[PDB]
């Protein structure tokens, strides 16, 4: 059995058809879809505290399911007293089935558990179908336990879509039921 | 758009570097190049002193009726060896042609090897 | 009509020294190109050119007669030495005499406007206007008197009184050429 995420089932069985009708696309897979979700977290203070970076990496692992990579400093800078090549950030890429499952978990479970959650700004679009927005308290995810955290942390989420514009991606996200603050 | 374009560009860069690392082929020891489509598998033997294809083979050839598996390319390499021996070429230089020497190409090359072709 | 005619004769010298000798003989080397023809190399009388076209603009058009043919040419270029007031080459761009064509033509402002007299502000939005005519009838520059233009008045493009066979070509007919606010 090719086990399939419920999001993938929902997409393939409805969303393709509604978007074809709604945007008069000539051929079927002119329809937008999702290629990757990038979860990033920038801990510049890790240059003092290694525990911060280790905790962030581990908490990302529990949140998603796959291990993270610690990015390095592209350029040595003094304003943040950064030496080139130091460990500064940590990111995870989600694709395919894991991507769909994580987005389902997020939209239905973790966005609800945010303090004063009143939707998400439906305008954080880079003009090319890529939607990036932040979450300040990772504790919204029930996966991580409260006691073991060493410092409350946030993280940025970027959703990359095959769409050529923002309208297409916003329509796809709305069909997915993404709680945009509107 | 740009992603497919850059994938193509990387393939071309690899191909070019491979070519001038292995050098050109001569009538004594010509060059064997391959091409791996989503459906088929092609091989050509080229003499660059003329730009001429001395011999060639592919899975499109109906009579062979091979597939696109390791087994099939093993048999295809056997056929290529027997076709080249009658044209008395035993030394070849193996242009992997932008691919990585592994899997299907590994089996192809080793099959040319067990039957007296110097690659 | 003569004052738009220019006499030339062909030259076959083609050298720096040769051109210097010609200009010493008080003529001007010149070339004519356009309409896909072979370039014509010729020479012009400097005194005649000075007398007739002492005020030539990019939009001046004239007639070249080699005694055997007539050509309608724009003065595409003229290599002038300012210190010695010396022309030392002319480029003539030929056009078809009967083909309507466009060209930006500058404006010339005359009169003292009542609005500016009384406290108006000149703002010359447009320094030129796209007009349309056969080559021989293109206006050298289009005049505009501001005297009746009072305060808070802009000049419409149709308001420009125009020579006979000259016609407006601007896509925006209602744009303002000069305003007095």
């Amino acid at each position: 059995m090719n086990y399939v995420p419920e999001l993938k089932k929902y997409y393939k069985d409805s969303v393709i058809k509604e978007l074809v009708k709604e945007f008069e696309y000539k051929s079927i897979m002119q329809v937008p879809k999702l290629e990757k979700i990038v979860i990033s977290v920038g801990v510049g203070e890790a240059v003092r505290n290694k525990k911060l970076l280790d905790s962030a990496v581990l908490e990302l692992a529990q949140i998603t399911g796959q291990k993270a990579v610690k990015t390095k400093a592209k350029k040595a800078i003094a304003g943040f007293k950064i030496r080139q090549g130091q460990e500064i950030g940590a990111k995870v890429t989600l694709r395919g089935n894991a991507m769909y499952e994580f987005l389902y978990k997020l939209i239905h479970l973790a966005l609800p558990r945010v303090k004063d959650f009143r939707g998400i700004n439906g305008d954080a679009f880079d003009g090319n179908g890529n939607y990036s927005f932040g979450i300040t308290e990772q504790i919204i995810f029930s996966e991580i336990d409260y006691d073991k955290i060493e410092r409350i942390s946030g993280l940025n989420i970027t959703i990359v879509t095959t769409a050529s514009n923002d309208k297409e991606s916003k329509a796809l996200l709305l069909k997915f039921g993404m709680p945009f603050s509107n | 758009m740009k992603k497919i374009k850059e994938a193509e560009q990387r393939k071309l860069r690899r191909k070019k570097r491979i070519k001038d690392k292995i050098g050109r082929g001569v009538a004594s020891r010509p060059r064997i190049t391959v091409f791996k489509s989503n459906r088929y598998f092609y091989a050509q033997v080229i003499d660059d002193s003329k730009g001429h294809t001395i011999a060639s083979i592919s899975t499109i050839e109906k009579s062979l009726n091979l597939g696109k598996n390791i087994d099939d390319v093993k048999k295809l390499g056997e056929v290529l060896a027997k076709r080249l021996k009658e044209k008395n070429i035993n030394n070849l230089i193996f242009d992997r042609n932008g691919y990585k020497y592994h899997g299907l190409i590994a089996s192809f090359a080793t099959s040319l090897r067990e039957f007296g072709i110097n690659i | 009509e003569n004052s738009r005619v220019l006499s030339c004769q062909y030259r076959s010298s083609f050298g720096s020294s040769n051109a210097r000798r010609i200009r010493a003989k008080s003529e001007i080397p010149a070339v004519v190109y356009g309409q896909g023809k072979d370039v014509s190399h010729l020479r012009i009388k400097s005194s005649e050119f000075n007398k007739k076209f002492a005020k030539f603009t990019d939009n001046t058009v004239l007639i070249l007669d080699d005694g055997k043919l007539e050509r309608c040419v724009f003065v595409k270029d003229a290599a002038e030495n300012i210190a010695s007031k010396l022309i030392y080459h002319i480029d003539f761009y030929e056009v078809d005499r009967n083909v309507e064509l466009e060209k930006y033509v500058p404006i010339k402002l005359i009169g003292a406007s009542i609005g500016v007299k009384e406290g108006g502000i000149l703002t010359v939005l447009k320094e030129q206007v796209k007009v349309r005519s056969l080559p021989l009838d293109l206006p050298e520059f289009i005049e505009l008197d501001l005297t009746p233009v009072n305060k808070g008045d802009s000049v419409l493009l149709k308001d420009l009184v125009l020579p006979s066979n000259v016609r407006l070509a601007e896509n925006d007919e209602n744009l303002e050429v000069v305003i007095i606010k």
Partner: protein, 138 residues
């Protein structure tokens, strides 16, 4: 004064300056120009003396454009020294002008007043000059 605010190199070699001008030799921003009839160097300070003359003569009538900027150091050894050490030190700044450089341009005023003002300017420069109207407009 008029002087560059930053230089790659503080001192540069005195070339030989010759030939007429093949560029910057046409009236561009104005109505009347002050062409030179020689090839020489115009110091920044003579430049600003001529500029004061023109601007003061013009009672707000129009605008003045300066078509040269010095940017060339002129070094001079200390007063009493011998020929030893080398390349003493920048003293003042020179601009290069060739026969045919427009060098100065004026807008707005009547031709007579412009000609007067610009002879008043020419009285303070080290080169022969000529006042030119556009010679293709009026």
């Amino acid at each position: 004064m008029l002087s560059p605010k930053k230089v790659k190199y503080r001192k540069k070699q005195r070339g030989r300056l010759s030939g007429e001008a093949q560029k910057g030799n046409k009236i561009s921003f104005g109505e009347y120009g002050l062409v030179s009839l020689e090839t020489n160097f115009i110091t920044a300070r003579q430049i600003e003396a001529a500029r004061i003359a023109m601007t003061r003569k013009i009672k707000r009538g129009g605008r003045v454009w300066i078509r040269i900027f010095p940017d060339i150091p002129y070094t001079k050894k200390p007063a009493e020294t011998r020929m030893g050490k080398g390349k003493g030190g920048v003293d003042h700044w020179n601009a290069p002008v060739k026969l045919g450089t427009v060098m100065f341009e004026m807008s707005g005023v009547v031709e007579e007043l412009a000609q007067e003002a610009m002879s008043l300017a020419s009285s303070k420069l080290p080169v022969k000059t000529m006042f030119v109207v556009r010679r293709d407009l009026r």
